[PDB]
Structures are given as structure tokens and as C-alpha cells.
Amino acid sequence: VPRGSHMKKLLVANRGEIAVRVFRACNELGLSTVAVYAREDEYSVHRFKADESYLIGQGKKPIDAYLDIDDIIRVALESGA
């Protein structure tokens, strides 16, 4: 078992139905949640289902925003996920 496996907060590095599916599971497990969203996806339901959410991939095309490894990690660390 890796060190640091205890969890209070989880971030989904995704969008759409699968992100909402994960948030639901998190909430039922007493975990708080974090969404990321591209600018063009700002009305996505998953953005509003999380306890907090953050824009990512500023100035990139929308698919590249969701593939932006370092910006996703940045959000995870900043939010305390």
C-alpha cells in the first residue's frame, strides 16, 4: 500500500458523463470533489456538479486543454486534492 493513500478530496481529470459518474461515487464515499474544464466546455454539467472547479488549458484548443498534464496537476496541488 503506497504512503499517502488516505483521501479527503479527489479531482477528475476528465469531463462529461464520466466525470459526473465519479463525483457521484466520491460524494457517496464522503469525499469532496474537484472538476477541471476547458473554456469552451464552461457550461458542462460536470463543472457544476463538483464541490469546486477550475479552468484549465487557457489559450489552448479545447481537446488539448484536457490533455494538459501539468495544468491538471497544478490544479490538483492548488486545490489540495
Binding site: 500500500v1 503506497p2 493513500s5 488516505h6 483521501m7 479527489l10 469531463r15 462529461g16 458523463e17 464520466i18 459526473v20 459518474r21 465519479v22 457521484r24 461515487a25 466520491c26 457517496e28 464515499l29 469525499l31 476547458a38 469552451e40 466546455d41 457550461y43 458542462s44 454539467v45 479545447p62 481537446i63
Partner: protein, 163 residues
């Protein structure tokens, strides 16, 4: 669909054991799916998807097991049986059958090109044996061209496949 209702329970068990054999061999951790092609009572490995899948939903319905909660508890270091509470293999439920369809904006009369535009009306059904896992579909939502065309995943489940 789940289970593979057109194949015999024995042959299905064989396929399931082969998947377990591979995963035991490599010490697989968390959720994954092993994919086979099947032809006249032989089966051939094609792929492992080392992640949850879009169709996990129907497996949840026929087993009673919440796969995504299981993934998260597994990552927390928990034991499938002692803490997550899953039974031993031979006790894993098999409760009727389930079907999943993805409803998308692909227009079948226009070569399945995904439509875009504002959703004026979205009324989703429910009742017994219906599960919905919604994407981006609500009244007023503008479907953009940037992402996939999924509106909502629908699953049905019942004791009998025909129901």
C-alpha cells in the same frame, strides 16, 4: 449487453477465468477489462483496457457491485473482501440482464454527423429498470462541435432479457 445471454454459462465462465488468469499473472490493480473475440466456442485475447469503461454500468446492474466506488476504495489501499465487502468469486451475484445505449446527436440521416445547437426540450424517462447517466443535455444547453456527441447513456435492466 450483460451478461452475454447468447452464450452458454459454461463457456462464459471459461472466458471469465482466462481473464482472471491473465490479471493474476501480472498482479493487476484496480478496474480493468479484458477483451476477447469469440468464434464457434473458441476465444482469442485482443486487448486489456487498464481503466473503467463507458459500459461499466451494465455490469454494476447485474452484479450489484458499484465499480467506481470500488476503484476509489482500491486506490485507498482497501481489501476487496474485508473492507470493500465483495464476496468470493463464486458468490458474485448475477441478477438478470442489462442493456446500454448511448444517445448522441449523431444524425443517422446525415451519415451520423453530430448535430450541434441549442437543446430546447429535454425530458428524461424513468421508472423500474431504467438507469440514466447523463452527459451534457439539459434544456438550454448548446451542444458545441468541440467534444463527443453523447447526450445521455441509457441502461435498462430486468430479470429476463426480453423484458
Amino acid at each position: 449487453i450483460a451478461p452475454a445471454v447468447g452464450l452458454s454459462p459454461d463457456f462464459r465462465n471459461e472466458i471469465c477465468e482466462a481473464a482472471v488468469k491473465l490479471c493474476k499473472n501480472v498482479g493487476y490493480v484496480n478496474a480493468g477489462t479484458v477483451e476477447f473475440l469469440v468464434k464457434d466456442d473458441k476465444f482469442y485475447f485482443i486487448e486489456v483496457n487498464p481503466r473503467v469503461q463507458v459500459e461499466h454500468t451494465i455490469t454494476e446492474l447485474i452484479t450489484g457491485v458499484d465499480i467506481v466506488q470500488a476503484q476509489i476504495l482500491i486506490a485507498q489501499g482497501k481489501d476487496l473482501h474485508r473492507e470493500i465487502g465483495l464476496p468470493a468469486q463464486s458468490e458474485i451475484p448475477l441478477l438478470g440482464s442489462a442493456i446500454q445505449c448511448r444517445i448522441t446527436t449523431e444524425d443517422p440521416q446525415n451519415g451520423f454527423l453530430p448535430d450541434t445547437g441549442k437543446i430546447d426540450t429535454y425530458r428524461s424517462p424513468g421508472g423500474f429498470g431504467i438507469r440514466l447517466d447523463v452527459g451534457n443535455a439539459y434544456a438550454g444547453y448548446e451542444v458545441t462541435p468541440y467534444f463527443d456527441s453523447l447526450l445521455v447513456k441509457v441502461c435498462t435492466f430486468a430479470n429476463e432479457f426480453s423484458d
